[PDB]
Amino acid sequence: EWQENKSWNAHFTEHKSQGVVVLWNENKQQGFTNNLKRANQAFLPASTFKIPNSLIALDLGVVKDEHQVFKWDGQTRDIATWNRDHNLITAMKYSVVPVYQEFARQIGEARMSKMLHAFDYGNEDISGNVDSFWLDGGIRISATEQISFLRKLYHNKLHVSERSQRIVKQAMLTEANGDYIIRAKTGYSTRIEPKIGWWVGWVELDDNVWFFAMNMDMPTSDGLGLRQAITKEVLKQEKIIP
Ligand SMILES: CS(=O)(=O)NCc1ccc(-c2cccc(C(=O)O)c2)cc1
Ligand SMILES: [Cl-]
Secondary structure (H helix, E strand, O other): OEEEOHHHHHHHHOOOOOEEEEEEEOOOOEEEEOOHHHHOOOEOOHHHHHHHHHHHHHHOOOOOOOOOOEOOOOOOOOOHHHOOOEOHHHHHHOOOHHHHHHHHHHHOHHHHHHHHHHHOOOOOOOOOOOOOHHHHOOOOEOHHHHHHHHHHHHOOOOOOOHHHHHHHHHHOEEEEOOOOEEEEEEEEEOOOOOOEEEEEEEEEOOOOEEEEEEEEEOOOHHHOOHHHHHHHHHHHHOOOOO
């Protein structure tokens, strides 16, 4: 079932922000959100698309493994961490768009379209340029649709090899301590209004998994840290993490 908890709106109001957090309790098969409407509103996935993009590149052999080095093309860009060599792990960590644009060009329109339909990913529409449609093309996905996709990935139920899914979940590793593990991916969509930030993934506990997907209005990059901060406040409130 689904349950709306508007008390979470305080975590956005507190920060002069608007957004949605969607939680899914895997053991109980129950979902929770502050805003049922926005939970089902579809936005550009931006760098959260690096999850499916990584899966497709690996399954087709465009990426051999997580150690393969993708050499910097020598073009200086405004994000210093992009001006260096990367592998799959670091390209995900630093959300290195130009590495994944090359992935998409090697994947090609036909195979990209087939794979996103096989994944049931969002509106499955890659209209636009093959190397930028997740930033300014026609593809759209909602917070609830992110969770449906992530749940299949967690259970190795996507229509790619188990190896491809294991590698991507490794690359999603964001935080780990004695109490929980977070595998997630951030997103930042600026090319089409409304500008939003994403954070999607899950929290692994000893005996349960909580999937999450959040997006929030992001008029400037100054508030990007709120994607994780707001999500963790909700997780703390619901006593999922200490
Ligand atoms: C129109 S703009 O000038 O406001 N945006 C340009 C811009 C700003 C930040 C990034 C970036 C890079 C790496 C990580 C993250 C993140 O959110 O984790 C955001 C990319 C591009
Ligand atoms: Cl791992």
